[PDB]
Design a protein around this ligand. Structure first.
Ligand SMILES: CCCCCCCCOCCOCCOCCOCCO
Ligand SMILES: CCCCCCCCOCCOCCOCCOCCO
Ligand SMILES: CCCCCCCCOCCOCCOCCOCCO
Ligand SMILES: CCCCCCCCOCCOCCOCCOCCO
Ligand SMILES: CCCCCCCCOCCOCCOCCOCCO
Ligand SMILES: CCCCCCCC
Ligand SMILES: CCCCCCCC
Ligand SMILES: CCCCCCCC
Length: 170
């Protein structure tokens, strides 16, 4: 189980608290509460990660969000390839049916010096009623329980900044 708090600003603000767990069988569940300045929301996600082998995995997922402004059903399929022990790549297709469109999100993540991770995320969003996002995240496993992190992204025009920390139970 982990609990992840994150603050976001551009150049109002957004905050979130995301609690999640992935079981050794592959089943995962998360619940997130979000507030922004006012709006609020909650999201729940259930998924299975199915590992074909040490390199390739596929993760179908189900999510519903309920809010002031965002209210969507967003199922998804995420494929992952471990290129090396330190380097992974993923691609996620996530349509949204909200009150429709889809996002396509690619991720490249590289772990170095045991405790650091640098991640690049490219996200393409297209409505049916496009935007491209570039994001860089840097995380540091400070100890067995705490993983602070920062993200800087460009949303296309403007910059989106996040700071957060993930606490893991042991
Ligand atoms: C939701 C904020 C980000 C996740 C941190 C909450 C984890 C709760 O377990 C904390 C146990 O270790 C902390 C011991 O120090 C107590 C500090 O109390 C603040 C907890 O909210
Ligand atoms: C395995 C299928 C999907 C798992 C969903 C689990 C969540 C079920 O909880 C429903 C109970 O509602 C609690 C309070 O409702 C607040 C609104 O919920 C936010 C998103 O629906
Ligand atoms: C992006 C569309 C293709 C991805 C598969 C659809 C996922 C939504 O499935 C709906 C069923 O919801 C229940 C699933 O909850 C258990 C976790 O397993 C994920 C399978 O959906
Ligand atoms: C790893 C398996 C799961 C990954 C998703 C499976 C299928 C994804 O289809 C993508 C749908 O978009 C079609 C065109 O792709 C456009 C790529 O981005 C450039 C924008 O034109
Ligand atoms: C081992 C690979 C993983 C590390 C990759 C991290 C660095 C990747 O940086 C690419 C991010 O590109 C950001 C582009 O910024 C958008 C510029 O938009 C114009 C300014 O408004
Ligand atoms: C099992 C720990 C995550 C909690 C998710 C709650 C879903 C309603
Ligand atoms: C993995 C079984 C379901 C866990 C749900 C925890 C309470 C909402
Ligand atoms: C301490 C040097 C500044 C690092 C800048 C990083 C900007 C993304």
């Amino acid at each position: 189980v982990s609990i992840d708090y994150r603050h976001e600003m551009q150049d109002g603000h957004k905050d979130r608290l995301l609690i999640s767990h992935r079981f050794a069988n592959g089943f995962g569940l998360s619940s997130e509460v979000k507030w922004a300045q006012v709006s609020n929301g909650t999201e729940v996600v259930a998924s299975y990660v199915y590992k074909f082998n040490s390199v390739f995995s596929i993760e179908p997922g189900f999510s519903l969000e309920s809010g002031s402004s965002n209210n969507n059903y967003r199922p998804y399929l995420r494929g992952r390839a471990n290129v090396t022990d330190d380097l992974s790549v993923a691609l996620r297709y996530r349509p949204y049916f909200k009150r429709k469109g889809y996002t396509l999100t690619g991720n490249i993540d590289y772990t170095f010096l045991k405790d650091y991770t640098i991640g690049y995320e490219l996200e393409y969003k297209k409505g049916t009623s496009y935007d491209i996002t570039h994001n860089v995240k840097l995380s540091y496993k400070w100890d067995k329980n705490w993983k602070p992190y920062v993200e800087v992204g460009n949303v296309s025009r403007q910059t989106r900044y996040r700071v957060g920390v993930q606490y893991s139970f042991h």
